[PDB]
Amino acid sequence: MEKRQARNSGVRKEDVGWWDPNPAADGNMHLGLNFDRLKYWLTAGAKPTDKVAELLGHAGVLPKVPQPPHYNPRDPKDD
Amino acid sequence: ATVGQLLGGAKTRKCRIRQLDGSPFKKGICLRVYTTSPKKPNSANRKLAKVQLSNGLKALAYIPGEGHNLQEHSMVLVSGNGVRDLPGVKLRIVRGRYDCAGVKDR
Amino acid sequence: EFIGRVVSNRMQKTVVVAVSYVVWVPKYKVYQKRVARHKARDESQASVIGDIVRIRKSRKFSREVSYSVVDTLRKAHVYDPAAAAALVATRDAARAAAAASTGRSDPWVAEAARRLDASAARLAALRELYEKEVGPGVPLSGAVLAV
RNA sequence: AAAUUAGAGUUUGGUGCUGGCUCAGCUUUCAUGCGCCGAGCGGUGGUUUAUACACAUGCGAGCUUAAGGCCACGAGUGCGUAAUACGCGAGUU
RNA sequence: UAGUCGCGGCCUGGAACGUAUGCGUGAUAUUAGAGUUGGAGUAAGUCGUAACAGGUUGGGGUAGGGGAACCUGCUCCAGAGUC
RNA sequence: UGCUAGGUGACCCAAUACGGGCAUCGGGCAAAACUCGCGUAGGAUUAGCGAGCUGGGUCGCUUUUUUUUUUCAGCGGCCCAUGGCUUAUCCUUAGCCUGUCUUAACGGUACUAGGCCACGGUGGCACUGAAAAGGGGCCACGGUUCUUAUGAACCCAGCAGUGUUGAAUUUUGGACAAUCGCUUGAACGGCGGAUCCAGAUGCUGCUUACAAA
RNA sequence: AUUGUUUGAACACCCCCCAAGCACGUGCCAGAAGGGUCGGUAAAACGUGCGGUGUCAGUAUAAAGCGUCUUGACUAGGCAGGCAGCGCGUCUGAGCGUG
């Protein structure tokens, strides 16, 4: 998955990972990545996008990223 | 193996009704509303229908039910069942549609 | 790497080579033999028709010349007429000289004696080759004596 | 702990062949009648199957410090192509 | 050291070639169809005996003759009877 | 060549103290583009290929850049060797493969999603870009409208929707919140008929009597 | 955690294949059928009521693809005898080839 392909296309990348954002009864997030090619791709300069960087930091195999520079009232009812 | 058999094996995927042209149902305008006498040992005057169909070609159609109301310039829906009692005719007029509707008290 | 017979050399610095490659067909479970033709660069034009050559991929030189000749394995022996007349001279010289030296011993008896002793010298030679290779042993198998 | 072969009726005074037709199998449609349209959670699927026919109207690539800087990725169809195609396998200047 | 200098960047120029296009003149392809003929289908219009022991023993063959079924030769096959 | 991280700045912006853009360098991995080995619908009522139909030389084939060593092709012009193929050409069908259905298997054939290619009403061509055009540029065609007729404007095989034909084909819906893309150094920023959610509609898996806590 | 009781509605079929049968109606007429076909005045198929079998918010018809179909046979047909050995030979194709 480079910049060219879409989300669901056939990709040379092996895994975005075993992933399940749905909460599951306790320890609510999923099991994380399978491994050993994730470090190769992030080593090779393949970029992460914003939330995979948050998820990789949150799993603690990478350090986390601070998101907010300022606060203005976000609307939670947009959905 | 034997190389003649190796070259011995897409044909014509033949529609066994060649007037519906692979489709199940084609409409059309009835050219003539007429009856005929059938092959022995049948002798009841069966009522038929020559229809100028959707595909621009013509074939005869069996008229079912206790009478009907079809005249000249009349649209029908033609189905794919044949009537055996006269040769060469393969079409059935389904009832529950257009100017040919259902009979009274069926 | 292909090892395939030449069929054409009428052609500048380039020989047309045919190779017997066998393709599978899945329908009848039978390997069908086809032969495809390739155009290949040679450099010395030492390939007479009937030579068994080794072609290999190199840089493409043309639209359709794509391999290069590596080595000619078995040379095709060719018709030289003057050398053929020389073999006529040597061969009937050998026949007439042998019949004159031989010619009671009808000449068949002498030649068949020479072929018998030649075969005997051969059999003694390859038997001693087997003797030096194996030692004193029954000719049961060499696979037994490979231990 | 490897999960692997259904026929019958039809031809003839009858019997057996000879091959064909049909029905019972599975899958498939905004198929066509007749009948319900209680309400929710979902999967999915439409190649407007066809017309690569003609398109009313509206919207789909705009962002950003007048000016300049970035917008070939996504969506649709299969005309053409029987082979610079597509697939598979080796090596790349 | 002040008009020089400019290998190098931007600009009026001609032009082989290159569609669609025109009267000639070819190919493959399409339905319209003049117009002829054949196959098939059909309960009662109809003329003779091919066929079957089957009444001239028929026919694969190539030509002749007759309002019609057909027959005339010449080798074959017996896949017609039958002693 | 394209991305991401570094390191640099006689640059620009921000800064009660320091980070961004902007230029250049180089490490990482990467795409791209070419080449060849094979596979591939039938037709003799297609039998020779109306052609450079294949090869060799010569040039043109629009850059040097780390140590011993380094840089395709008929693509065009010219000679030239006269050969190259013979299911060769020509016709017509057809996007291709995995798929899906079935069969016990071998096989035989309409989809799912998705891989690649092709095309954008038709045909020709160029700019820029490293690489070319589905709502970018020019011309010719064919349509659709209008002119006071001289000429201009537009091209749904994008979404909804209209019309013919069809047995049959859906709502002129909401929204950037989730992705993912494009963009922007504030701002949970801006946009996206991709998508995500709702509709109509075949197939399906799965519930369904009310009352009351 | 709380309490009461219960099986709809249709469609097709009902001679054999194929599960299911009788009455009146009309008698080769109206008709049905996928095939064999049934009606030619005592219809177990067609007009209708009763009764029953399949599927069930579905059901039948129509088509289409596969199988059945060894019905293009490689697994897996054959070829005097249904249909199928070319009139015969020369024959360096391809293929099979240690006396």
Return the structure tokens found at C23.
Answer: 């393709």
Percent of residues in chain C assigned helix, strand, coil, to nearest 5:
35, 30, 35
CB contact under 8 A, C30 and B6: yes
Rg (CA), chain C: 26
Could you give the maximum distance between any two Cα atoms of chain A, in Å?
A: 41
Q: Is C80 exposed, middle or buried (0-12, 13-18, 19+ CB in 10 A)?
A: exposed
What are the tokens at C8?
A: 């054409």
**Nearest by Cα to A14 from A43, A45, A44, A35:** A35
Peptide bond into B38 cis (omega under 30): no
Q: Tokens representing C70?
A: 């590596």
The set of residues, in sequence order, having a beta carbon less than 8 Å from that of C95 and lying 6+ positions away, is none
The structure tokens listed for C129 are 């080759």
Question: Please, are residues C30 and C77 in contact by the beta-carbon 8 Å criterion?
Answer: no
> In angstroms, what CA-CA distances link C135 with B75, C124, C144?
104, 14, 13
Four-point Cα dihedral B35, B40, B44, B48, nearest 10: -30
Q: CA C87, C1' F38: Å apart?
A: 47
For C24-50, b/e burial (b = at least 16 CB within 10 A) is eeeeeeeeeeeeeebbbbbeeeebeee
| C-alpha to C-alpha distance for B69 and B103, rounded to whole angstroms | 9
Helix ranges (H only) for chain B are 3-6
CA of B74 vs chain C CAs: smallest distance (Å) = 53
How far is Cα C111 from Cα A22, in angstroms, rounded to an integer?
Answer: 100
Using a 7 Å cut-off to protein CB atoms, list the covered nucleotides of chain F: 2-5, 27-31, 35-42, 54-57, 72-75, 81-86, 106-110, 113-116, 165-168, 175-182, 186-189, 194
Please give the single-letter amino acid code of residue B18.
R
Residues B50 and B78: beta-carbon distance below 8 Å: no
Place of tokens 């079409």: B91
Q: Among C28, C31, C35, which would you mutate to test the B interface (most chain B Cβ atoms within 10 Å of its Cβ)?
A: C28
- Using a CB–CB cutoff of 8 Å, tell me whether C25 touches chain B: yes
Method: cryo-EM
Calculate how close chain C gets to B22, using CA atoms only, in Å: 29
DSSP C36: E
Burial bucket for residue B48 (CB in 10 Å: 0-12, 13-18, 19+): buried
- Confirm if B6 and C32 have CB atoms less than 8 A apart: yes
Q: Does B5 contact C32 at a Cβ distance shorter than 8 Å? A: no
Burial class of residue B97 (count of CB atoms within 10 Å of its CB; 0-12, 13-18, 19+): middle
Burial class of residue B51 in the structure, from the number of CB atoms within 10 Å of its CB (0-12 exposed, 13-18 middle, 19+ buried): buried
Two structure tokens written together for B103: 């009979």
Contact C6, C45 (CB under 8 A): no
Resolution, expressed in angstroms to one decimal: 4.2
The rounded distance, in Å, linking the Cα atoms of A35 and A8 is: 21
Contacts B4 to C, Cβ<8 Å: none
